[PDB]
Design a protein around this nucleic acid. Structure first.
Ligand SMILES: CSCC[C@H](NC=O)C(=O)O
Ligand SMILES: [Mg+2]
Ligand SMILES: [Mg+2]
Ligand SMILES: [Mg+2]
Ligand SMILES: [Mg+2]
Ligand SMILES: [Mg+2]
Ligand SMILES: [Mg+2]
Ligand SMILES: [Mg+2]
Ligand SMILES: [Mg+2]
Ligand SMILES: [Mg+2]
Ligand SMILES: [Mg+2]
Ligand SMILES: [Mg+2]
Ligand SMILES: [Mg+2]
Ligand SMILES: [Mg+2]
Ligand SMILES: [Mg+2]
Ligand SMILES: [Mg+2]
Ligand SMILES: [Mg+2]
Ligand SMILES: [Mg+2]
Ligand SMILES: [Mg+2]
Ligand SMILES: [Mg+2]
Ligand SMILES: [Mg+2]
Ligand SMILES: [Mg+2]
Ligand SMILES: [Mg+2]
Ligand SMILES: [Mg+2]
Ligand SMILES: [Mg+2]
Ligand SMILES: [Mg+2]
Ligand SMILES: [Mg+2]
Ligand SMILES: [Mg+2]
Ligand SMILES: [Mg+2]
Ligand SMILES: [Mg+2]
Ligand SMILES: [Mg+2]
Ligand SMILES: [Mg+2]
Ligand SMILES: [Mg+2]
Ligand SMILES: [Mg+2]
Ligand SMILES: [Mg+2]
Ligand SMILES: [Mg+2]
Ligand SMILES: [Mg+2]
Ligand SMILES: [Mg+2]
Ligand SMILES: [Mg+2]
Ligand SMILES: [Mg+2]
Ligand SMILES: [Mg+2]
Ligand SMILES: [Mg+2]
Ligand SMILES: [Mg+2]
Ligand SMILES: [Mg+2]
Ligand SMILES: [Mg+2]
Ligand SMILES: [Mg+2]
Ligand SMILES: [Mg+2]
Ligand SMILES: [Mg+2]
Ligand SMILES: [Mg+2]
Ligand SMILES: [Mg+2]
Ligand SMILES: [Mg+2]
Ligand SMILES: [Mg+2]
Ligand SMILES: [Mg+2]
Ligand SMILES: [Mg+2]
Ligand SMILES: [Mg+2]
Ligand SMILES: [Mg+2]
Ligand SMILES: [Mg+2]
Ligand SMILES: [Mg+2]
Ligand SMILES: [Mg+2]
Ligand SMILES: [Mg+2]
Ligand SMILES: [Mg+2]
Ligand SMILES: [Mg+2]
Ligand SMILES: [Mg+2]
Ligand SMILES: [Mg+2]
Ligand SMILES: [Mg+2]
Ligand SMILES: [Mg+2]
Ligand SMILES: [Mg+2]
Ligand SMILES: [Mg+2]
Ligand SMILES: [Mg+2]
Ligand SMILES: [Mg+2]
Ligand SMILES: [Mg+2]
Ligand SMILES: [Mg+2]
Ligand SMILES: [Mg+2]
Ligand SMILES: [Mg+2]
Ligand SMILES: [Mg+2]
Ligand SMILES: [Mg+2]
Ligand SMILES: [Mg+2]
Ligand SMILES: [Mg+2]
Ligand SMILES: [Mg+2]
Ligand SMILES: [Mg+2]
Ligand SMILES: [Mg+2]
Ligand SMILES: [Mg+2]
Ligand SMILES: [Mg+2]
Ligand SMILES: [Mg+2]
Ligand SMILES: [Mg+2]
Ligand SMILES: [Mg+2]
Ligand SMILES: [Mg+2]
Ligand SMILES: [Mg+2]
Ligand SMILES: [Mg+2]
Ligand SMILES: [Mg+2]
Ligand SMILES: [Mg+2]
Ligand SMILES: [Mg+2]
Ligand SMILES: [Mg+2]
Ligand SMILES: [Mg+2]
Ligand SMILES: [Mg+2]
Ligand SMILES: [Mg+2]
Ligand SMILES: [Mg+2]
Ligand SMILES: [Mg+2]
Ligand SMILES: [Mg+2]
Ligand SMILES: [Mg+2]
Ligand SMILES: [Mg+2]
Ligand SMILES: [Mg+2]
Ligand SMILES: [Mg+2]
Ligand SMILES: [Mg+2]
Ligand SMILES: [Mg+2]
Ligand SMILES: [Mg+2]
Ligand SMILES: [Mg+2]
Ligand SMILES: [Mg+2]
Ligand SMILES: [Mg+2]
Ligand SMILES: [Mg+2]
Ligand SMILES: [Mg+2]
Ligand SMILES: [Mg+2]
Ligand SMILES: [Mg+2]
Ligand SMILES: [Mg+2]
Ligand SMILES: [Mg+2]
Ligand SMILES: [Mg+2]
Ligand SMILES: [Mg+2]
Ligand SMILES: [Mg+2]
Ligand SMILES: [Mg+2]
Ligand SMILES: [Mg+2]
Ligand SMILES: [Mg+2]
Ligand SMILES: [Mg+2]
Ligand SMILES: [Mg+2]
Ligand SMILES: [Mg+2]
Ligand SMILES: [Mg+2]
Ligand SMILES: [Mg+2]
Ligand SMILES: [Mg+2]
Ligand SMILES: [Mg+2]
Ligand SMILES: [Mg+2]
Ligand SMILES: [Mg+2]
Ligand SMILES: [Mg+2]
Ligand SMILES: [Mg+2]
Ligand SMILES: [Mg+2]
Ligand SMILES: [Mg+2]
Ligand SMILES: [Mg+2]
Ligand SMILES: [Mg+2]
Ligand SMILES: [Mg+2]
Ligand SMILES: [Mg+2]
Ligand SMILES: [Mg+2]
Ligand SMILES: [Mg+2]
Ligand SMILES: [Mg+2]
Ligand SMILES: [Mg+2]
Ligand SMILES: [Mg+2]
Ligand SMILES: [Mg+2]
Ligand SMILES: [Mg+2]
Ligand SMILES: [Mg+2]
Ligand SMILES: [Mg+2]
Ligand SMILES: [Mg+2]
Ligand SMILES: [Mg+2]
Ligand SMILES: [Mg+2]
Ligand SMILES: [Mg+2]
Ligand SMILES: [Mg+2]
Ligand SMILES: [Mg+2]
Ligand SMILES: [Mg+2]
Ligand SMILES: [Mg+2]
Ligand SMILES: [Mg+2]
Ligand SMILES: [Mg+2]
Ligand SMILES: [Mg+2]
Ligand SMILES: [Mg+2]
Ligand SMILES: [Mg+2]
Ligand SMILES: [Mg+2]
Ligand SMILES: [Mg+2]
Ligand SMILES: [Mg+2]
Ligand SMILES: [Mg+2]
Ligand SMILES: [Mg+2]
Ligand SMILES: [Mg+2]
Ligand SMILES: [Mg+2]
Ligand SMILES: [Mg+2]
Ligand SMILES: [Mg+2]
Ligand SMILES: [Mg+2]
Ligand SMILES: [Mg+2]
Ligand SMILES: [Mg+2]
Ligand SMILES: [Mg+2]
Ligand SMILES: [Mg+2]
Ligand SMILES: [Mg+2]
Ligand SMILES: [Mg+2]
Ligand SMILES: [Mg+2]
Ligand SMILES: [Mg+2]
Ligand SMILES: [Mg+2]
Ligand SMILES: [Mg+2]
Ligand SMILES: [Mg+2]
Ligand SMILES: [Mg+2]
Ligand SMILES: [Mg+2]
Ligand SMILES: [Mg+2]
Ligand SMILES: [Mg+2]
Ligand SMILES: [Mg+2]
Ligand SMILES: [Mg+2]
Ligand SMILES: [Mg+2]
Ligand SMILES: [Mg+2]
Ligand SMILES: [Mg+2]
Ligand SMILES: [Mg+2]
Ligand SMILES: [Mg+2]
Ligand SMILES: [Mg+2]
Ligand SMILES: [Mg+2]
Ligand SMILES: [Mg+2]
Ligand SMILES: [Mg+2]
Ligand SMILES: [Mg+2]
Ligand SMILES: [Mg+2]
Ligand SMILES: [Mg+2]
Ligand SMILES: [Mg+2]
Ligand SMILES: [Mg+2]
Ligand SMILES: [Mg+2]
Ligand SMILES: [Mg+2]
Ligand SMILES: [Mg+2]
Ligand SMILES: [Mg+2]
Ligand SMILES: [Mg+2]
Ligand SMILES: [Mg+2]
Ligand SMILES: [Mg+2]
Ligand SMILES: [Mg+2]
Ligand SMILES: [Mg+2]
Ligand SMILES: [Mg+2]
Ligand SMILES: [Mg+2]
Ligand SMILES: [Mg+2]
Ligand SMILES: [Mg+2]
Ligand SMILES: [Mg+2]
Ligand SMILES: [Mg+2]
Ligand SMILES: [Mg+2]
Ligand SMILES: [Mg+2]
Ligand SMILES: [Mg+2]
Ligand SMILES: [Mg+2]
Ligand SMILES: [Mg+2]
Ligand SMILES: [Mg+2]
Ligand SMILES: [Mg+2]
Ligand SMILES: [Mg+2]
Ligand SMILES: [Mg+2]
Ligand SMILES: [Mg+2]
Ligand SMILES: [Mg+2]
Ligand SMILES: [Mg+2]
Ligand SMILES: [Mg+2]
Ligand SMILES: [Mg+2]
Ligand SMILES: [Mg+2]
Ligand SMILES: [Mg+2]
Ligand SMILES: [Mg+2]
Ligand SMILES: [Mg+2]
Ligand SMILES: [Mg+2]
Ligand SMILES: [Mg+2]
Ligand SMILES: [Mg+2]
Ligand SMILES: [Mg+2]
Lengths: 55, 122, 114, 208, 119
RNA sequence: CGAUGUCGGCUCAUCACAUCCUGGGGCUGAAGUAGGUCCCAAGGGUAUGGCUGUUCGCCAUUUAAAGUGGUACGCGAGCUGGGUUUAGAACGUCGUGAGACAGUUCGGUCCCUAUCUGCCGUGGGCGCUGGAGAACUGAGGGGGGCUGCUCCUAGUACGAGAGGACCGGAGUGGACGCAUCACUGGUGUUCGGGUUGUCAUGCCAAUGGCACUGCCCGGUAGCUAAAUGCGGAAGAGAUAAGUGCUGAAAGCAUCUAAGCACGAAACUUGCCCCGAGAUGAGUUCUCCCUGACUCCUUGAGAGUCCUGAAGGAACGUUGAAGACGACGACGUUGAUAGGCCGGGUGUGUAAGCGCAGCGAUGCGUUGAGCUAACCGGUACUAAUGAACCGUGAGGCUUAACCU
RNA sequence: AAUUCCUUGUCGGGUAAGUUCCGACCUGCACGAAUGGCGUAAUGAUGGCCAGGCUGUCUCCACCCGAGACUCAGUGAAAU
RNA sequence: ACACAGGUGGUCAGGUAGAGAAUACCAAGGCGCUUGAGAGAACUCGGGUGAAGGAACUAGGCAAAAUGGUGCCGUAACUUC
RNA sequence: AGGACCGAACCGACUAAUGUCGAAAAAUUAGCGGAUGACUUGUGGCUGGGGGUGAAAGGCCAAUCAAACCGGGAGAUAGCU
């Protein structure tokens, strides 16, 4: 337990280098409607692979 | 699977009714005996007319065990009681004239050919 | 797999008589006195049966002289010569381990006879 | 030399005298040679083999070309074996299980089963501390890991909790039982590393 | 280490986990479509699809089993009468998963589960 | 002294050699067996119990041995708190008394989520000079090194007898390690059954809920040890202690000063693992990119239209892989998972009805029904067309050199 | 001996083995008669020792069931 | 000090089993405890089961395990009867 | 009849584990003692700091006790840091 003496801005930074989260960069396009969504996920309106799923 | 503090019923008629293993012989840090291994015994209960009195330290051979004896074929022979035959420390050989109950084939290691002849089964 | 199942099916002796648990079985067993080759008997009540094809087995309990003996036989072993059935028990359990705790009159079982 | 082969469980062979010898069933298909490495090019003499069969898509171009060089079909994975001076093989040659017909004992190498992050009790056979008799939050822990001021440090190669298994290991001098030429099997006495389906690099016993 | 094992614990005890599938399987058959967490949807398949097979052979013992499971005579009535003969030609795969993003209050990966018909 | 937790035990160790065992030797008041001492040797091994807080010690029984020490009399941010040092009380003793006494006796809170170093695991980044995917090489590092007893040589050598070998060889043990789950078993709150109380589905019957899985009996896969395989090696190099050969200095002599040999579990290899971040960044193999333009301080400059490859990542189904990353299998040109079908297994004769009975119940249909992770199949459901990052023939200086 | 220093006194019992325990011996360092002496049934979350039963306390750990630990989203400390 | 698993006096006392206001399951009536979702490592916590042995553990059977109800039969030394 | 027996309420606090920047400035969980009396408890009184009260531990007297707490002498004094 307990730090003997405080770490720096640098160390604190060096630890956080990996905390940066990645983007999706992989948006789909629905065949019929042409709406953007995640791969293997349904659309906002309710489509999946050019067919109506949920009203 | 016999070890220090294991109590044993006695197969032969030397005198002892119940005995206790005080040591397993034949190596350092040796955990268990069984099958037909030598152990050191103390007599915790003896009959009045027997050859050996109570609280006497002597050697013995484990003839029956509850955990049992494995064969070469994959079969196993178990029993319903851990049992041993008493021996004469330096002389070896069984003290009792007769042996009650069965005894396994893996006991057939010469020196014990006296023990197998007296036993009724196996 | 098929590769294993092919290796198991060739070894299995194809003439094992059917017996249930609670049957008074008399197993014949090959024993060897150095040079000799004898057939020992081992009559007793069947307590448990393990079916795994080639890896099958069964427990025979025999209350011999003095104390009880319990012998697990590997059904497809060449040491097991033959497995004759004397009686068939009217028990309604696969494993009869409660018979270890019983002796004499309590240990005896009803006859099937159907 | 040695052969590659998939582990296919275990069985037991009943010998006529009585003994039920426990055997591992190793399928050893036609191990076909992709490259013959030698002292002119490589600085050592060896053969690279393959076995099984990838689907016509999962193999990439760099790997698929490597197979066209020899002319063999794209077998799944690739392995190498060092030649023992005298023996010499050709590219596109199909080695069979018959190489183990003459030998008695074999070293089987494989990938041991993955136990994961194992503790010191499991991994290094550490003794658990007293389960009661006062004990507080330290039953299965390692206990001490060093001295004091003197090293002022834990020594390297200290036995600690970590990744157990999923490592290449060799069980040496396993006695061969049967060499099924027709079914392409190699029955060996005992148990070999890895689970059913894992790849086994079998070879003759170095400890002769 | 859980090698070769099956069944998701889902941060619950056994009797609870068996109940929440008994409720959710009942709910799926009634409404014919459900929004739930992607693993709950996945593990609902293991429970529901065996009820649809049991529902094909309409008799008594099967009704009593299908009532021993579910524990709702309505769901046992919607099985056998409707969903039994409707999934007669189809050999397995009576249910279908469709991922629908994430839950607002906790970011759980949601997923619609429904019967392969809705007509 | 604005605190460096003091004995003993447990867990975990690690080094020294002044070696307890195992290995190699000299002398011996060494016939052999067994010693005695001394020399080299630190590779590996080195009790379990009774008593006491004990360390130690004595005692019982093992063992080849039960080594001596260092490591804050190793190790309390790892555990214990029996002892010693708080407050209570008592005994003896000392004190007129308050109280006091390595004199004794009974009872008496052991805190800390780890920043850094270190250590065991496991990844992301960039590098290794076109990119990519594979297969190696090995610098270097780590692992492993225990040993009994039985028989054979041989009742041989040796010895008056009794006793009893070296040197070799074989077998089977213990301990320890590695692997595995074929067997024997354990486990198995996801499989089957019995059954107590009570509540429920209208009720009977049949189910289910709750009672620690309500209590039990069995048990599939998995994981597993007490279960079953395997291991320490022979081999070589250089030696330690020692034994020698030839041979001076020193007509001889003497193992050495030239020259030449032997010689141990030590040392270097051999056996297993990791391992080119080995920046000294090695090799082999295959794969992929062969288009334009302007711009100025003409530079490995900076640009612009186009092209986007090999391949990777991402996403999905997932795994005998896994904390998370990662690692492996599969994505419709498909058995990756779920289902479904058929087994196998398990439990042990379901339900309904029928009959015998006053009733409980008994049969009968019936080895039935129900069967988790098993096995073999099967595209029925879900794994989507695409996007995405990754480019455009890869410096300079020489040398060997092909036209 | 809650008192004994020399001390693990000496002998006996129990145990394979007992610095503890129980019985006795007096050599009471330094017991002793209402700061009570010696007995003593009953009683005790009392101190010491032995036996049976029972047990994962242990030989020697194994698996299983939940709650955290671990990952994702939200909120978000502390000693130093 | 808190929407803090603490403390706080009196009254009302349904069913089944039970000696019972114990306990189990329920009724009336009330609640699911103001972070969830995954995964199913070590390790900790609370539990379950355990082959053979059975106090060998340890300062000490600490902790667990075990015994357990009602009726009847029977029940020793010692005793202040 | 009983400072009788077993055992809930109630009162206690022997053991263990958990907790030890806790859920809690003394608690939780499983066992544990008393439970018709020297019992326990509600409401209101009385006793005051060298004073009280104390089946006596130097215990308790508002989370404070070998002499409370608050204000004052008061910036006590300090050969000490
Ligand atoms: C309160 S008395 C403390 C006694 C002391 N303990 C630690 O140092 C000794 O030394
Ligand atoms: Mg500082
Ligand atoms: Mg971070
Ligand atoms: Mg004696
Ligand atoms: Mg053995
Ligand atoms: Mg069993
Ligand atoms: Mg493609
Ligand atoms: Mg791929
Ligand atoms: Mg690969
Ligand atoms: Mg794995
Ligand atoms: Mg272990
Ligand atoms: Mg292991
Ligand atoms: Mg231990
Ligand atoms: Mg404690
Ligand atoms: Mg702690
Ligand atoms: Mg604890
Ligand atoms: Mg604590
Ligand atoms: Mg700790
Ligand atoms: Mg802690
Ligand atoms: Mg130093
Ligand atoms: Mg230093
Ligand atoms: Mg061998
Ligand atoms: Mg699976
Ligand atoms: Mg789980
Ligand atoms: Mg959670
Ligand atoms: Mg329940
Ligand atoms: Mg709807
Ligand atoms: Mg909805
Ligand atoms: Mg289910
Ligand atoms: Mg099913
Ligand atoms: Mg069917
Ligand atoms: Mg300081
Ligand atoms: Mg210590
Ligand atoms: Mg010790
Ligand atoms: Mg130790
Ligand atoms: Mg020396
Ligand atoms: Mg010396
Ligand atoms: Mg010599
Ligand atoms: Mg060493
Ligand atoms: Mg060395
Ligand atoms: Mg060496
Ligand atoms: Mg001990
Ligand atoms: Mg004792
Ligand atoms: Mg003491
Ligand atoms: Mg010491
Ligand atoms: Mg010492
Ligand atoms: Mg001393
Ligand atoms: Mg000593
Ligand atoms: Mg000792
Ligand atoms: Mg001795
Ligand atoms: Mg001795
Ligand atoms: Mg001896
Ligand atoms: Mg000896
Ligand atoms: Mg000696
Ligand atoms: Mg010192
Ligand atoms: Mg110390
Ligand atoms: Mg210490
Ligand atoms: Mg420390
Ligand atoms: Mg103490
Ligand atoms: Mg005092
Ligand atoms: Mg005076
Ligand atoms: Mg003192
Ligand atoms: Mg004192
Ligand atoms: Mg004392
Ligand atoms: Mg004390
Ligand atoms: Mg006390
Ligand atoms: Mg204490
Ligand atoms: Mg305490
Ligand atoms: Mg404590
Ligand atoms: Mg601590
Ligand atoms: Mg680090
Ligand atoms: Mg590491
Ligand atoms: Mg990386
Ligand atoms: Mg990467
Ligand atoms: Mg890069
Ligand atoms: Mg280059
Ligand atoms: Mg190049
Ligand atoms: Mg290149
Ligand atoms: Mg490259
Ligand atoms: Mg090297
Ligand atoms: Mg090395
Ligand atoms: Mg090493
Ligand atoms: Mg030896
Ligand atoms: Mg002879
Ligand atoms: Mg002679
Ligand atoms: Mg002889
Ligand atoms: Mg010699
Ligand atoms: Mg020798
Ligand atoms: Mg010798
Ligand atoms: Mg030899
Ligand atoms: Mg060790
Ligand atoms: Mg082992
Ligand atoms: Mg299996
Ligand atoms: Mg079910
Ligand atoms: Mg019933
Ligand atoms: Mg009702
Ligand atoms: Mg209902
Ligand atoms: Mg009713
Ligand atoms: Mg009914
Ligand atoms: Mg019926
Ligand atoms: Mg039930
Ligand atoms: Mg209910
Ligand atoms: Mg309830
Ligand atoms: Mg409860
Ligand atoms: Mg009971
Ligand atoms: Mg069982
Ligand atoms: Mg079983
Ligand atoms: Mg073996
Ligand atoms: Mg050598
Ligand atoms: Mg050499
Ligand atoms: Mg040499
Ligand atoms: Mg000369
Ligand atoms: Mg050796
Ligand atoms: Mg050597
Ligand atoms: Mg040797
Ligand atoms: Mg090599
Ligand atoms: Mg190598
Ligand atoms: Mg390797
Ligand atoms: Mg390693
Ligand atoms: Mg590795
Ligand atoms: Mg690397
Ligand atoms: Mg490189
Ligand atoms: Mg180079
Ligand atoms: Mg250009
Ligand atoms: Mg230019
Ligand atoms: Mg540019
Ligand atoms: Mg562009
Ligand atoms: Mg692009
Ligand atoms: Mg192109
Ligand atoms: Mg591609
Ligand atoms: Mg592409
Ligand atoms: Mg790339
Ligand atoms: Mg998945
Ligand atoms: Mg990721
Ligand atoms: Mg990846
Ligand atoms: Mg594909
Ligand atoms: Mg399949
Ligand atoms: Mg197909
Ligand atoms: Mg069928
Ligand atoms: Mg079956
Ligand atoms: Mg029947
Ligand atoms: Mg029937
Ligand atoms: Mg039923
Ligand atoms: Mg029926
Ligand atoms: Mg029935
Ligand atoms: Mg009839
Ligand atoms: Mg009738
Ligand atoms: Mg009548
Ligand atoms: Mg049948
Ligand atoms: Mg069946
Ligand atoms: Mg199924
Ligand atoms: Mg399948
Ligand atoms: Mg499809
Ligand atoms: Mg097809
Ligand atoms: Mg289709
Ligand atoms: Mg260019
Ligand atoms: Mg070119
Ligand atoms: Mg160029
Ligand atoms: Mg006295
Ligand atoms: Mg007194
Ligand atoms: Mg004394
Ligand atoms: Mg005696
Ligand atoms: Mg004595
Ligand atoms: Mg004791
Ligand atoms: Mg005395
Ligand atoms: Mg005097
Ligand atoms: Mg006095
Ligand atoms: Mg007087
Ligand atoms: Mg007086
Ligand atoms: Mg008095
Ligand atoms: Mg007195
Ligand atoms: Mg008294
Ligand atoms: Mg009292
Ligand atoms: Mg007591
Ligand atoms: Mg006592
Ligand atoms: Mg006694
Ligand atoms: Mg006794
Ligand atoms: Mg629970
Ligand atoms: Mg928690
Ligand atoms: Mg994900
Ligand atoms: Mg967070
Ligand atoms: Mg702060
Ligand atoms: Mg709240
Ligand atoms: Mg209270
Ligand atoms: Mg009031
Ligand atoms: Mg009223
Ligand atoms: Mg009634
Ligand atoms: Mg009531
Ligand atoms: Mg209640
Ligand atoms: Mg009711
Ligand atoms: Mg309500
Ligand atoms: Mg919560
Ligand atoms: Mg868990
Ligand atoms: Mg537990
Ligand atoms: Mg636990
Ligand atoms: Mg069970
Ligand atoms: Mg057990
Ligand atoms: Mg048992
Ligand atoms: Mg016992
Ligand atoms: Mg006892
Ligand atoms: Mg002891
Ligand atoms: Mg005892
Ligand atoms: Mg003691
Ligand atoms: Mg002790
Ligand atoms: Mg207790
Ligand atoms: Mg209990
Ligand atoms: Mg009773
Ligand atoms: Mg009774
Ligand atoms: Mg009754
Ligand atoms: Mg009486
Ligand atoms: Mg008596
Ligand atoms: Mg009298
Ligand atoms: Mg008495
Ligand atoms: Mg009186
Ligand atoms: Mg009264
Ligand atoms: Mg009373
Ligand atoms: Mg009382
Ligand atoms: Mg009471
Ligand atoms: Mg209550
Ligand atoms: Mg309390
Ligand atoms: Mg307290
Ligand atoms: Mg309590
Ligand atoms: Mg009570
Ligand atoms: Mg009481
Ligand atoms: Mg009072
Ligand atoms: Mg009062
Ligand atoms: Mg009060
Ligand atoms: Mg009061
Ligand atoms: Mg007043
Ligand atoms: Mg006043
Ligand atoms: Mg005043
Ligand atoms: Mg008071
Ligand atoms: Mg005082
Ligand atoms: Mg205050
Ligand atoms: Mg005080
Ligand atoms: Mg004052
Ligand atoms: Mg003044
Ligand atoms: Mg001042």
């Amino acid at each position: 337990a307990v730090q003997q003496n405080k770490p720096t801005r640098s160390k604190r930074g060096m630890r956080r280098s990996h905390d940066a989260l990645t983007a999706v960069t992989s948006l789909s396009v629905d065949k019929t409607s042409g709406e953007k969504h995640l791969r293997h996920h349904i659309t906002a309106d309710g489509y999946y692979r050019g067919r109506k799923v949920i009203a | 699977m016999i070890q220090e503090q294991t109590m044993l019923n006695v197969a032969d008629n030397s005198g002892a009714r119940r005995v206790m293993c005080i040591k397993v012989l034949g190596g350092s840090h040796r955990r268990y005996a069984g099958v037909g291994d030598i152990i050191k015994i103390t007599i915790k209960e003896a009959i009045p007319r027997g050859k050996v009195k109570k609280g006497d330290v002597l050697k013995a051979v484990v003839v029956r065990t509850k955990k049992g004896v494995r064969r070469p074929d994959g079969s196993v022979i178990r029993f319903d009681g851990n049992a041993c035959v008493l021996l004469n420390n330096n002389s070896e050989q069984p003290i009792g004239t007769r042996i009650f109950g069965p005894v396994t084939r893996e006991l057939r290691s010469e020196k014990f050919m006296k023990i197998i002849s007296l036993a009724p089964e196996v | 797999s098929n590769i294993i199942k092919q290796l198991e099916q060739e070894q299995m002796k194809q003439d094992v008589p059917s017996f249930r648990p609670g049957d008074t079985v008399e197993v014949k067993v090959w024993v060897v006195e150095g040079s000799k080759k004898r057939l020992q008997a081992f009559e007793g009540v069947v307590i448990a049966i393990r079916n795994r094809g080639l890896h099958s087995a069964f427990t025979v309990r025999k209350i011999s002289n003095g104390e009880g003996v319990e012998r697990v036989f590997q059904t497809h072993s060449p040491v097991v010569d033959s497995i004759s059935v004397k009686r068939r028990g009217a028990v309604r359990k696969a494993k009869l381990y409660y018979l270890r705790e019983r002796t004499g009159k309590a240990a005896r079982i009803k006859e099937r006879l159907n | 030399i040695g052969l590659v082969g998939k582990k296919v469980g275990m069985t037991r062979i009943f010998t006529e005298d009585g003994v039920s010898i426990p055997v591992t069933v190793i399928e050893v298909e036609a191990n076909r040679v992709t490259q013959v490495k030698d002292l002119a090019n490589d600085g050592y003499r060896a053969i690279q083999v393959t076995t099984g069969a990838k689907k016509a898509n999962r193999v990439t171009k760099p790997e698929a070309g490597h197979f066209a060089k020899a002319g063999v079909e794209a077998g799944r994975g690739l392995w190498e074996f060092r030649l023992a001076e005298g023996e010499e093989f050709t590219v596109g040659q199909s080695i069979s299980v018959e190489l183990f017909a003459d030998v008695k004992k074999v070293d089987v190498t494989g990938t041991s089963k993955g136990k994961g992050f194992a503790g010191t009790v499991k991994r290094w056979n550490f003794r658990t501390q007293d389960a009661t008799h006062g004990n507080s939050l330290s039953h299965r822990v390692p206990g001490s890991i060093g001295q004091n001021q003197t090293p002022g440090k834990v020594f390297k190669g200290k036995k600690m909790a970590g990744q157990m298994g999923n490592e290449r290991v060799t069980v040496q001098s396993l006695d061969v039982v049967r060499v099924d030429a027709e079914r392409n099997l190699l029955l060996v006495k005992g148990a070999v590393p890895g689970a059913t389906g894992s790849d086994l690099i079998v070879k003759p016993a170095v400890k002769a | 280490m859980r090698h070769r094992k099956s069944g998701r614990q889902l941060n619950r005890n056994s009797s609870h986990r068996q109940a929440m599938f008994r409720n959710m399987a009942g709910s799926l058959v009634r409404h014919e479509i459900i929004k739930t967490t992607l693993p709950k949807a996945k593990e609902l398949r293991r429970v529901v699809e065996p009820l649809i097979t049991l529902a094909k052979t309409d008799s008594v013992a099967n009704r009593r089993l299908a009532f021993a499971r579910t524990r709702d005579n309505e769901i046992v009535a919607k099985l056998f009468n409707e969903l039994g003969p409707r999934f007669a030609s189809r050999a397995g795969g009576y249910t279908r998963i469709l991922k629908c993003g994430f839950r607002a209050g906790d970011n759980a990966p949601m997923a619609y589960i429904e019967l392969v018909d809705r007509s």
